[PDB]
Amino acid sequence: DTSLPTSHTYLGADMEEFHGRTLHDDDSIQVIPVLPQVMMILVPGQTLPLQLFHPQEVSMVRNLIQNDRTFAVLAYSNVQEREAEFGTTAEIYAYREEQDFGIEIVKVKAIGRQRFKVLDGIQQAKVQILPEAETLMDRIKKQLREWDENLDSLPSNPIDFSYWVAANLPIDDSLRIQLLKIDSAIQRLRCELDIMNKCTSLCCKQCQETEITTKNEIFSLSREGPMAAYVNPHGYVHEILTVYKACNLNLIGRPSTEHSWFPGYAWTVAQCKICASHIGWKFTATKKDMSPQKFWGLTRSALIPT
Numbered sequence: 001d002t003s004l005p006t007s008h009t010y011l012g013a014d015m016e017e018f019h020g021r022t023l024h025d026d027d028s029i030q031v032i033p034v035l036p037q038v039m040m041i042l043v044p045g046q047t048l049p050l051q052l053f054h055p056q057e058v059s060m061v062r063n064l065i066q067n068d069r070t071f072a073v074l075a076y077s078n079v080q081e082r083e084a085e086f087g088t089t090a091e092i093y094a095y096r097e098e099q100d101f102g103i104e105i106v107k108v109k110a111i112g113r114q115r116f117k118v119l120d121g122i123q124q125a126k127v128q129i130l131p132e133a134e135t136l137m138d139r140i141k142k143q144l145r146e147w148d149e150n151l152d153s154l155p156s157n158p159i160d161f162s163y164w165v166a167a168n169l170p171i172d173d174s175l176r177i178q179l180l181k182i183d184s185a186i187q188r189l190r191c192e193l194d195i196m197n198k199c200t201s202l203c204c205k206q207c208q209e210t211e212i213t214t215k216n217e218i219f220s221l222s223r224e225g226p227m228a229a230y231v232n233p234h235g236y237v238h239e240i241l242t243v244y245k246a247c248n249l250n251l252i253g254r255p256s257t258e259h260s261w262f263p264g265y266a267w268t269v270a271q272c273k274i275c276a277s278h279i280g281w282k283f284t285a286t287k288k289d290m291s292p293q294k295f296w297g298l299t300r301s302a303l304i305p306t
């Protein structure tokens, strides 16, 4: 099944689901707290799960559930210098309250809503909400067919499809930001097709020499998409692109299934042979009656396109 990765079941069903809808207006200037450790570009309709281990973060996120459940996800240009000029609001839609070592913990799931331009050290961003072609759709929903025949799994609005594509393409974060800056769906669908056009193989960040896999190997195991944010037990948020065949990847260890992001499967660290840096995880179903038996979930972070 493909709902289950989207469920972040590894975290826990726990308690608390918020079916409210909180949506601002066009050219509206808001004030939205920034969560200090999130460094991931987010996109309307893109899910984000978090484990907040730190008391101040665990206070703001608690006082959010009381207010609008909505915070700001910055689209950092430099990141090492909190440089950003766009972002997307996040609205919390699940929740949890744990305790481990007398540390109060908080597990949340959020979802992108609205983009915006960027106008007690919590840090609060004043933002201008930004405002919201079947031809191009076809020509994308096709060349997606030629990458994973599986691609029912795709949205129908020109405005939602364009974000699906923005979240699921293996592109430079530079390109992700370019796509968020676009103020039109048609225009956003036209940059996408021109990006899938000039795509190629993905070399590892560190040596920039060994191809590790290609666009053609990509395949979806989740309804939300081949690409997805999953969080480890640390609290670190990983961006995981699933594929069928990755070349030049040794394996370290012996399979495990604690905290597996995909129910039913087991993971094992993989390692670039060229510089030995950890590239992601190879997977292996826990039962001989599941398909595909073995796939890879690589990290975006480790992969520099050719």
Ligand SMILES: Nc1cccc2c1CN([C@H]1CCC(=O)NC1=O)C2=O
Pocket (backbone or CB within 6 Å): 231, 232, 233, 234, 258, 259, 260, 261, 262, 267, 281
């Ligand atoms: N237990 C442990 C300790 C240190 C790092 C990590 C883990 C588990 N994990 C990942 C592995 C892949 C998966 O599907 N689930 C996870 O959560 C990590 O990245």
Ligand SMILES: [Zn+2]
Pocket (backbone or CB within 6 Å): 204, 205, 206, 207, 208, 210, 272, 273, 274, 275, 276, 277
């Ligand atoms: Zn390498």
